[PDB]
């Protein structure tokens, strides 16, 4: 093989909205995960079920690079067993998650003077999302007993709201680009990889 293209995900020019989170099924090699950990560019770098140093020391199959954009207060939601707007209705991590949560501030990138619609999120949902479920339905939500016929109005709301990304916003409301690395380790005797 050769090098592994983590630059395509982290250094992407544009990210997907959180409700329509992009998933990058990479499978070329293993890169030096110990290189990405000590990178000061990433402020949130939390791993689960495995230590960051031993990722290159371990062995897995498909490694999914989930990437999307949320706000600073919603960063702590990208974690197992959390709830809220994002964790329940946009991107859900399982209780037995095996991977890492990488996040960094993207106010210098995804914010525009006067707001930045673009990035959106699913407001509500009849039930909480399954783990790794992507809901991209743009159907008008029927909050009352009267049908909506796809019309916005009373008890008929558009299920997606746009983030209002301005540079003058507080850091808790600033855009944060998140990369969720999910990979399925092998099942060898505790000698080869264990």
């Amino acid at each position: 093989t050769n090098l592994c293209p983590f630059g395509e995900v982290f250094n992407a020019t544009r990210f997907a909205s959180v409700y329509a989170w992009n998933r990058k099924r990479i499978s070329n090699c293993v890169a030096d995960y110990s290189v990405l950990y000590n990178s000061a560019s990433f402020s949130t770098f939390k791993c689960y079920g495995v230590s960051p140093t031993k990722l290159n020391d371990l062995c897995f199959t498909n490694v999914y690079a989930d990437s999307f954009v949320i706000r600073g207060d919603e960063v702590r939601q990208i974690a197992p067993g959390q709830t809220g707007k994002i964790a329940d209705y946009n991107y859900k991590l399982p209780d037995d998650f095996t991977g890492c949560v990488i996040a960094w501030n993207s106010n210098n990138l995804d914010s525009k003077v006067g707001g930045n619609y673009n990035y959106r999120y699913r407001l509500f949902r009849k039930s909480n999302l399954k783990p790794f479920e992507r809901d991209i339905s743009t159907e008008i939500y029927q909050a009352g007993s009267k049908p909506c016929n796809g019309v916005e109005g009373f008890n008929c709301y558009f299920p997606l709201q746009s983030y209002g990304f301005q540079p003058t916003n507080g850091v808790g409301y600033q855009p944060y680009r998140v990369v969720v690395l999910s990979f399925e380790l092998l099942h060898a005797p505790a000698t080869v990889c264990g």
Partner: antibody, heavy 119, light 109 residues
Framework: VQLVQSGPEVKKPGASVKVSCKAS????????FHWVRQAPGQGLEWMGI????????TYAQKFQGRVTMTRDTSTTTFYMELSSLRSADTAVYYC?????????????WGQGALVTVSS | EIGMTQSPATLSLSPGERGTLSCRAS??????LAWYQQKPGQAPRLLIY???NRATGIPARFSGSGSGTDFTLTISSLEPEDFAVYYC??????????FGQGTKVDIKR
Amino acid sequence: VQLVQSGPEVKKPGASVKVSCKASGDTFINSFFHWVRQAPGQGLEWMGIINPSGVSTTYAQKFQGRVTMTRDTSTTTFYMELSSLRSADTAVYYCARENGGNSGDFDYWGQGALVTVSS
Amino acid sequence: EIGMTQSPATLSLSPGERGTLSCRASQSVSSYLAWYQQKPGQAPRLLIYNASNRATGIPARFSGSGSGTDFTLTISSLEPEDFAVYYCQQHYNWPRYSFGQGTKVDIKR
């Protein structure tokens, strides 16, 4: 960030009142707006919500058919119109911003507008 | 709709004491719960959102815990500025919101 409400008003029983809420500072995109009243001898009572964009309002059960919440499609002024006023409608009416939705926050409030209903 | 019950109706503790305010929901609201402080003659002020997250600029002595039906607002060390009525608010079903009856926090004398 600032929420400015209209002056206080006194109305006869059966009349209607429209309270304004002029807002400035932060982008009101991605920020819903609510209306909550506090009767003098009572606590907070939620009335309804209006989204930043086109209406898509939701009113509380006790106010269904009595309140109409609109916007000023310019001055980012959110209106609460309450019809068929009775003595129990005498209360201080607050407007409040909600980021995101669902959870969100009542981060910032207005000063409150006293509506006094009596003959 | 969802009914919210706060207990006790009034809590009277001295400055420096540990304060515990309860908020019970008629049905599970997951972590969809927010706490508020209203000083006399003032508009309410958010303290905790999503049951356990501290809002911006809120003093560290305020904290929240709980999920589903039982929620708790804790003031680790009461200060005189904390004399107020505290309301909890549900939002599990996005369109609608209800408040608790409020627990008035008095400075015990």
